[PDB]
Design a protein around this ligand. Sequence first.
Ligand SMILES: [Zn+2]
Ligand SMILES: [Zn+2]
Ligand SMILES: [Zn+2]
Ligand SMILES: [Zn+2]
Lengths: 119, 119, 63, 60
Amino acid sequence: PASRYITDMTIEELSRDWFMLMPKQKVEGPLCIRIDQAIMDKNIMLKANFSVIFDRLETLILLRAFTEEGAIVGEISPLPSFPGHTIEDVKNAIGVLIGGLEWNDNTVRVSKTLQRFAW
Amino acid sequence: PASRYITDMTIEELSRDWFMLMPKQKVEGPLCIRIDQAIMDKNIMLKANFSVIFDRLETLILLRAFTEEGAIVGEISPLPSFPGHTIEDVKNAIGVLIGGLEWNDNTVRVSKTLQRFAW
Amino acid sequence: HHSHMSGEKTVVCKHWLRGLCKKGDQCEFLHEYDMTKMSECYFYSKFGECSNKECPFLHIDPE
Amino acid sequence: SHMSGEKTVVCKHWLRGLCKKGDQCEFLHEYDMTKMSECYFYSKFGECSNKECPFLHIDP
Ligand SMILES: [Zn+2]
Ligand SMILES: [Zn+2]
Ligand SMILES: [Zn+2]
Ligand SMILES: [Zn+2]
């Protein structure tokens, strides 16, 4: 079967540029992880746009963490200077992002598509 | 004569000690103002214990800022050494506390007794 | 020696920075991130100090 | 020692008033600046924005 795209985010959510009061950025392998250390006590939902092949996440386009008001508080994006990444790189990065949000007492949920294709 | 006492707080709330992740403390006149710079986006309620005379606050015992979950995130307390402060000193301090809380995008409300006798 | 704008917004909208503003172009404040037009830090101003090593707001000492 | 064993880490949830375990908690419900847990951000990102961070900033 041909690859198919999962698009949790709307065009607006995907293109929006967001602000971090206490910027945190980490390059992990072929991925970049960003999070605002100032964000606490919120219900956060991770949404992502990515391709899938054989019922498994293949390539991540963009993953962002949203509060209930729709504000972006963290994200995982591929680094240009890299030829690619694997679901394994994605999982490593998601763990770091979720860990920081949990540490700051945010309740973190993951989109059903991410739960299904990344697990 | 021994003035009337207003007690918005329970003995436990009045006796509890709280923690600030990003402590901010200012001594203004005979009063001490404290606030956690880390607290943002919450609905906060100001409660206080104070004596009243002539239909107005007379002497503040303690004022604390509570989140909906009952956690303390701010406070105005008289300095031990003094038995003397005015309602104007109290209002000034309240304005500084509310200003910091609102700057951090918290929605601040004041107890009915505080509204009735001071704010 | 000629200005193109009739005037300009002098301070960035802090609410917009945190997605709490719906006024768009019509807001009194600027909706773009200009580190040179950030408002004054309330905490540094009232308390004389601020806990954010990366605070983007103005820290003005008592003049 | 008077205690059969001792807690070693302060409860971060208790610090913020988020612990409902009381005396049954496995972590210390007392502010002991010398027994705070490791700062997640300093460890994972090698930096921390809080000038007054009370959590441990460990290095290689
Ligand atoms: Zn605005
Ligand atoms: Zn500042
Ligand atoms: Zn505990
Ligand atoms: Zn730290």
